[PDB]
């Protein structure tokens, strides 16, 4: 009955025509450069996920490039960036693992200051304005640090009562990805001194796959383990805005750990799969 936790892809991309139109404007602005990197923002809607989708879509438009106050109620802002190559060869030859790894390290550095900031996304692109074809690849850095850490889990029915409280807490606290129980069983913001004692953590989940949490869970668990290095057993609530929230009795375990007091490494995944289900770029024609 005790399983090694596995995960689902955190997001699926949809880049609207207007995104590529706006990218085109951007590229024409920096035609003489090898590349540019620009910030993006998307507002995630976790209440209106298609019944047939497996996770939250990332719906990108021209407005994603801008600092709009266009957020609707309960939407979760997510920050990322687009790295656009002006030469297709550079796009092709970019070492994708090293690149996503570096994005993960930034999430990590943000995460240890604030667990709620250890999530982001990146788009790498090449815009062929001659053929009006756009190549892009979404990456969502999901990391396990140290790379040796895994989680043993088994179902925990008893915590079903907390789900609606978390659902509402998350709706209101739109900038938060994590909450925990305090000593009075009330939901509060993550605080390492408190969870160390109460050992109940809830995560805002972006997947809809039955009983399989989003790979972003690894980011949060990594920060948790850094903050509370001797935490072993705890309860993990996976909170969704549909009926599919679930709870796990969790235990940190390790495979092939590094010697204590070495610089812990990290394992990183999160490149989006394409139309054929391969780890490869997507292509769009305008």
């Amino acid at each position: 009955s005790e399983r090694v936790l596995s995960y689902a892809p955190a997001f699926k991309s949809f880049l609207d025509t207007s995104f590529f139109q706006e990218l085109s404007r951007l590229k024409l602005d920096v035609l003489k450069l090898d590349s540019t990197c620009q910030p993006l923002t998307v507002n995630l809607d976790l209440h209106n996920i298609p019944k047939s989708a497996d996770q939250v879509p990332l719906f990108l438009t021209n407005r994603s490039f801008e600092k709009h106050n266009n957020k609707r109620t309960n939407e979760v802002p997510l920050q990322g960036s687009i790295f656009n190559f002006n030469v297709l060869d550079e796009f092709k030859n970019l070492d994708k693992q090293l690149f996503l790894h570096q994005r993960a390290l930034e999430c990590w550095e943000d995460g240890i200051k604030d667990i709620n900031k250890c999530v982001s996304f990146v788009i790498i692109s090449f815009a062929d304005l001659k053929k009006y074809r756009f190549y892009y690849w979404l990456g969502v850095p999901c990391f396990q640090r140290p790379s040796s850490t895994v989680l043993h889990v088994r179902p925990e029915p008893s915590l079903k009562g907390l789900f609606s409280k978390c659902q509402k807490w998350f709706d209101v606290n739109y900038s938060k990805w994590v909450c925990i129980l305090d000593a009075d069983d009330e939901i509060v913001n993550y605080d390492k001194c408190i969870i160390r004692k109460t050992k109940v953590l809830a995560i805002r989940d972006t997947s809809t796959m039955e009983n399989v949490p989003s790979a972003l869970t690894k980011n949060f668990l990594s920060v948790l383990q850094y903050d509370v290095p001797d935490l072993i057993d705890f309860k993990l609530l996976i909170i969704r805005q549909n009926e599919g929230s679930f709870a796990l009795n969790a235990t940190f375990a390790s495979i092939d750990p590094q010697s204590s007091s070495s610089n812990p490494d990290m394992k990183v995944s999160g490149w989006e799969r394409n139309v054929q289900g391969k780890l490869a770029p997507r292509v769009v024609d305008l």
Partner: peptide, 12 residues
């Protein structure tokens, strides 16, 4: 050569 490019960029 779209199909060729995508194949060359596939990772593991």
């Amino acid at each position: 050569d779209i199909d060729e490019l995508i194949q060359d960029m596939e990772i593991k």
